[PDB]
Amino acid sequence: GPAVIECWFVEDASGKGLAKRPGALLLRQGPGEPPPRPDLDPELYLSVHDPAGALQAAFRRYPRGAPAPHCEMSRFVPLPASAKWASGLTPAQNCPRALDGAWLMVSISSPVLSLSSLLRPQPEQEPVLITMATVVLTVLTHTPAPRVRLGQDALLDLSFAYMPPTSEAASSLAPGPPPFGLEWRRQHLGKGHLLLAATPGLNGQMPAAQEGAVAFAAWDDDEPWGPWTGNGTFWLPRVQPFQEGTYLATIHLPYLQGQVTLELAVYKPPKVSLMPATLARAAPGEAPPELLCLVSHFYPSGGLEVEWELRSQKAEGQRWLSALRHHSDGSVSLSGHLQPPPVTTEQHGARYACRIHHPSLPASGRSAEVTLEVAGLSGPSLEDSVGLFLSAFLLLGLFKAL
């Protein structure tokens, strides 16, 4: 419960290129004069009235001690939705009269939530120290940066709340929640898709959903009078690495849009194995075998750090890798190669170790070990004794022969 959110009003005029000015949002004014802020421009100091209560409730339970949320304000002019699927929300060309006045779009991002609000300032000398603004549409998500294992489901959260603005004595509409549109798109690496489009409360043809995705798009109730809360949760059945990136969710009402963005990251922990596993060969000097360390089926490809150790010490020997090998599931495999120097008696029982640090892995990483065998004073086996006897017998027989 900050009770105040510092915000950056971003100029929209072409002449001023993304200029920024200080402002504040006063979620809870409380009985009495609001805190004086002579440093702020009067129009950018807002006291927020939320009949729906979504914006208030979002920060009422905000974690203590967390960094202040990043807020940005901008001026908003209602426009009809340009997407063709959302064409039934505004059948008539005439702009609604109830949407007259000034509008502010507020975007508040944080590690715990991402929120967007449409506010209506009141022009309202003496009370100029504060500007009263009422919330109209709020769209928030509590999963602004989901992490999903490869092959698992994603449940991108989305909630919204809508209180219709003052009708200006023009509220001759059907009692009950108004129909709305829900849009879910993806953007990543210069590639965008309309994953899902819905218009709950209105019957029409929507573009087919992609990747078998569905949404819980509905009003939470059908009461005749607002405010109304609603759900827009996104369910992505199986998450492959090609579905990573930015997911944009938009709620559409006639001439009103509310957008939030999420960052979906896909991961898969590597499987590490040191291919030479039969200990090693003799070490009378020189002739060391080359050790291969295979890390298989890990995503993302980048960020993997392979290190060689002697068992703890920094292993010695030439080191290199191999170009990434890409699997059908989208993961990648890598091979490290170590060529140790001439092994001798001093390395008897010492293990060459390959250790992998990856973002998906724990802080310790994953390790593989190969023991370095050396030549010692091993006694002859029974088969060796039999072979010695047979060789001596054959040699003495040959000596007798010649």
Partner 1 sequence: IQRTPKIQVYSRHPAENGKSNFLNCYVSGFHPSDIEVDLLKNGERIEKVEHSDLSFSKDWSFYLLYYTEFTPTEKDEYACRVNHVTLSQPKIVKWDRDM
Partner 2 sequence: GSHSMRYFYTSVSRPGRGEPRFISVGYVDDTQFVRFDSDAASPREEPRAPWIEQEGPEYWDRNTQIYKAQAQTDRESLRNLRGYYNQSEAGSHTLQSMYGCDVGPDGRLLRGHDQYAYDGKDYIALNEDLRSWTAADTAAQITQRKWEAAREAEQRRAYLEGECVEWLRRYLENGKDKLERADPPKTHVTHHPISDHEATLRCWALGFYPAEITLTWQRDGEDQTQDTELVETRPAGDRTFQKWAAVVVPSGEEQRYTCHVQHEGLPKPLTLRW
Ligand X SMILES: *[C@@H]1O[C@H](CO)[C@@H](O[C@@H]2O[C@H](CO)[C@@H](O)[C@H](O)[C@H]2NC(C)=O)[C@H](O)[C@H]1NC(C)=O
Strands 305-310 and 114-121: unpaired
Of 84-103, which residues contact partner 2 (CB under 8 A)?
84
Q: How far is the CB of 22 from ligand NAG (least distance, A)?
A: 9
Which among ligand X, partner 1, partner 2, none contacts residue 238 (Cβ within 5 to 8 A by kind)?
A: none
Residue 216 engages ligand NAG in binding (rule: CB under 6 A): no
**DSSP 8-state class, residue 243:** G
Instruction: Answer with the entry of partner 1, ligand X, partner 2, none that 302 interacts with (C-beta below 5 to 8 A by kind).
Output: partner 1
Binding site for ligand X (CB under 6 A): 155, 159, 216, 231, 233
Report if residue 301 touches partner 1, rule: CB under 8 A.
Answer: yes
6 — phi, psi (to 5°)? -75, 135
Residue 323 interacts with partner 1 (CB under 8 A)?
yes
In 43-102, where do the E strands start and end? 45-49, 70-76
Whole-angstrom distance, CA of residue 280 vs CA of residue 78 = 74
DSSP state of 37: -
Query: Do 177 and 265 contact (CB within 8 A), yes or no?
Result: no
E strands, 205-299, are 214-219, 228-235, 245-253, 256-267, 271-274, 291-298
Q: Report the distance separating Cα 77 and Cα 103, nearest Å.
A: 7
- CA torsion angle for 155, 158, 159, 163 (degrees, to 10)? -160
Chain-centroid distance of CA 181 in Å reads 24
Q: Which is nearer to ligand NAG, 8 or 76 (CB)?
A: 8
Q: Which residue in the set 337, 365, 371, 373 belongs to the binding site for partner 1 (CB under 8 A)?
A: 337
**49 is an interface residue for partner 2 by CB under 8 A:** no
Q: Which of residues 183-212 bind partner 1 (CB under 8 A)?
A: 189-191
Report the interface residues with ligand NAG, using CB under 6 A. 8, 20
Report the interface residues with partner 2, using CB under 8 A. 10, 12, 14, 17-18, 20, 72, 74, 76-77, 79, 81-84, 105, 107, 185, 187-190, 192-194, 246, 248, 259, 261, 275, 323-329, 333
Report the interface residues with partner 1, using CB under 8 A. 189-191, 301-302, 320-324, 337
